[model samples]
Target: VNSFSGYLKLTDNVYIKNADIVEEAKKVKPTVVVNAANVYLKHGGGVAGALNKATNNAMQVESDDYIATNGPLKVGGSCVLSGHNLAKHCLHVVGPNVNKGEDIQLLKSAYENFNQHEVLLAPLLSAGIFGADPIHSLRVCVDTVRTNVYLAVFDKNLYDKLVSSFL
Candidate 1:
């Protein structure tokens, strides 16, 4: 979907909405678009791929540039890079891979990193292959993020979860 409506607020600055990150990023164009990125900063596929495609692959080149300049990111670590044709910047964070070892602190750190921004558009980090639990990811996003955050959820089940809890 390219946009969303009827977002429910969790707090003053936090909101839950149903939308794909790539599409919503185009509409909201927040201060930063959070990518559930890998340690290498490669926008190969999955969430990264969709967002990269939205930017017409400018994000892919920037991802490479970021890695070339700063080396690789670590779990729970993040870097702010130009958003290319979309948002002002893209905040890439390597959330903890639960399949590897679910480090709660690392997951918290991933969401906490968004504290630097005032308006943020993000997804449920590590919600896929990284294997972080959706509810737990939502929990950390609620607990840690201080910005005006819009949690863009693609799946209906996850969107239901947010609605049940917040709306």
Candidate 2:
């Protein structure tokens, strides 16, 4: 008798004894992927009302291991923070989100893995979720990481800042 679950197992004893599967699986190293969205700013202000609501949501989704506020931690308005675990550390970059240059500076300071010497495999900057441009967000993120440590971006345009910084 044979039992099958998701896939079918060979009915007979199909064992070649010795077989070397040399197929390269291309092990892509784990990287830090960060998502920024507009959340109620009050949650960050120690008010416990709006901030609590946002934190609860973030915790419920198991978003990021750690969270930080971008603005002054106000109420009613939307703020910025990180979601999902990627790098050995995750950072919730917060700011006005309007001035790209300023946000890059803040990100450099808020980088959770800045002190760690581990190589940053790659940094994922996701946008559009908050009505922001993907490419622009990537550029800001890449620039921020490069300013603080040695890192690379999978996208060419995003990595351009790093290349130009060296030159």
Candidate 3:
């Protein structure tokens, strides 16, 4: 359960995956999935898009309502979208937007700012369309959520690259 098919185990609860995130999420039902958020907290694309599709846009309305009240989430900040279609909730974190030239520093702050919970399924921050190095980003993820946390990574190529490097 710890290491397999490019999944790197940082601790008993934390592991890296280079696979289809949606499938993994299906496997770990009733878990809190985290989505990368925008200032507006819209569930449009990227990890947000994936989550939106999976949850039939249930997350969208919730986040939209939350942002409407609390305003947009700042970078390195987070909020919870409760009663997600897939899990108890979705932890919406404002990960660095690489399109805006955000880098590891912003990603570090985002992870550092994350409040821990039991089960968190997070896309590798800043590593996808954001264009940050996966390894480094995973390092930040591991460092931020150490023990007593189950961190799941959702991607295939990233998983391959990571498994090769660590194994």
lDDT of each: 0.81, 0.29, 0.68
lDDT of 3 by residue, 76-144 (tens): 788877736566767778888777866558787787645466556667777677667778877777667
Cα error of candidate 3 at position 60, Å:
1.1
Best candidate (score: TM-score):
1
List TM-score per model, in order.
0.90, 0.32, 0.83
Query: What is the TM-score of candidate 2?
Result: 0.32
Which segments of candidate 1 are over 4 A away from where they belong?
A: 1-5
Clashing pairs in 2: 42-74, 43-51, 63-84, 70-94, 70-95
> In what order do the candidates fall by TM-score, top score first?
1, 3, 2
lDDT winner, 1 or 3: 1
Q: Output the better candidate (2/3) by lDDT.
A: 3
Write down the RMSD of all candidates, one decimal each.
Answer: 2.9, 16.0, 3.1
Using lDDT as the measure, the top candidate is 1
**Per-residue lDDT of candidate 2, residues 1-167 (tens digit):** 21111211111211111111110001222232222322333223211222234345553233223223232431112222332222223333333343333343343343433334233222232322222343454445444443222222333453444344431
Query: Residue 138, candidate 2: how far off, in angstroms?
Result: 11
- Which residue segments of model 2 deviate by more than 4 Å? 1-27, 31-60, 64-91, 99-105, 122-150, 158-165
Q: After superposition, how far is residue 161 of candidate 2 from its true place, in Å?
A: 6.0
